[PDB]
């Protein structure tokens with residue numbers, strides 16, 4: 061069949077805030093396909109505990125490609141409305157006016173992220189992934205599809 065993923069969302073409006081329909085147990089995949097517009101300075105994928113804006117939902121994993129100068133990906137965590145220490149990845153595959161596929165795999169102690177079929181970064185858990193029930197996608201990005209593979 062054409063469906064290889066679960067709970068697929070097509071062509072969402074950005075900003076997108078959606079409930080993740082099952083638990084992010086080890087081996088679970090979040091697959092996001094899209095493209096970067098020509099004027100993009102940044103976009104982000106936020107794995108959140110809820111969708112509240114007061115207090116702002118904890119962001120277990122903020123995955124934030126940035127496009128100025130040489131480009132990078134910034135990752136961080138928001139706990140009780142405060143950012144932690146940034147982790148910057150300098151070898152970034154994202155480019156303005158290009159399409160991409162992000163695959164986030166949840167492991168026991170970290171996330172692993174591949175982009176366009178290549179391992180890109182790790183991010184150690186700072187909030188237990190059991191607290192994550194919401195997917196936010198924000199900023200200057202066009203999303204074609206979101207899908208899941210729940211373990």
Ligand SMILES: CC(=O)N[C@H]1[C@H](O[C@H]2[C@@H](O)[C@@H](CO)O[C@@H](O[C@H]3[C@H](O)[C@@H](O)[C@H](O)O[C@@H]3CO)[C@@H]2O)O[C@H](CO)[C@@H](O[C@@H]2O[C@H](CO)[C@H](O)[C@H](O)[C@H]2O)[C@@H]1O[C@@H]1O[C@@H](C)[C@@H](O)[C@@H](O)[C@@H]1O
Pocket residue numbers: 075104106113116122124134135136143146198199
């Ligand atoms: C200005 C901005 O884009 N704010 C974003 C916010 O970005 C921060 C995030 O990328 C962190 C990661 O560490 O870095 C911050 O900048 C650092 C900088 O990297 C560092 O060099 C310097 O020394 O310190 C800076 C400050 O710490 C970035 O500012 O990301 C969050 C989370 O995604 C955004 O909030 C979310 O926005 C969406 C809508 O896009 C939605 O509203 C969500 O509910 C919200 O959590 C934030 O967006 C801005 O602020 C929001 C509160 C809201 O007003 C948005 O409309 C606004 O664009």
Ligand SMILES: [Cl-]
Pocket residue numbers: none
């Ligand atoms: Cl913020």
Ligand SMILES: [Cl-]
Pocket residue numbers: 167168169170
């Ligand atoms: Cl692990």
Ligand SMILES: [Cl-]
Pocket residue numbers: 074075197198199
């Ligand atoms: Cl937005």
